Amino acid sequence: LTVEEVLYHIPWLDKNKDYINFIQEKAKVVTFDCGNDIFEEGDEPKGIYIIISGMVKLEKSTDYMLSGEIIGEINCLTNEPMKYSATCKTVVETCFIPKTHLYDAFEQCSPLIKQKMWLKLGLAITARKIR
C-alpha cells in the first residue's frame, strides 16, 4: 500500500524505523508494462527492486518472481554484472532503491544492513535446499 509498508517487509531493514525512514528518502515506486525488461544479462546493477505486484521471469541466455520478492541484492553487494535477464509477464509494480542510496545507508545508517542482506541470502539458500 505505502512505500513505508513495503520497506517494513524487507528482512534486512529489520523493521527499524530509522533505517526505513532513510531508505524512503530516495526509494521510488517504478512500474513496468507487460513484456518490458527490467534489465538484461550483462547490465551493471542499478539497485534493488521489491516486487509489489505482478510476475517477473528471470532468464539466463527460467525462474518466476512474485509479490514480496526482491531483485538485485547479490549484484548490489558484489557490484558484478547481472547474470540473467528479468522480463515482466504482467504489469509489474516495484519499489526501487538506487544502489548508491543503499551504499549510503551502509555508511550513514548501519553497516549491519549489509551483514543482514548476506544473512537473508544465506537463509534463502538453506531454505531453498530443503524446498
- Closest Cα partner for 76 from 53, 52, 43, 51? 43
How many structural domains is the chain composed of? Answer: 1
Q: How far apart are CA 94 and CA 10, in angstroms?
A: 13
The x, y and z cell numbers of residue 90, run together, are 504482467
Phi, psi of 119 (to 5 degrees): -60, -50
Position 74 in a domain: yes
Q: What angle do CA 48, 4, 93 make, to 5 degrees?
A: 50
Position 103 in a domain: yes
- Provide the CATH number for the domain around residue 30: 2.60.120.10
- Closest Cα partner for 86 from 113, 46, 114, 117? 46
Domain housing 82: 3-116
- Relative orientation angle of helices 99-108 and 17-24, to the nearest 10 degrees: 140
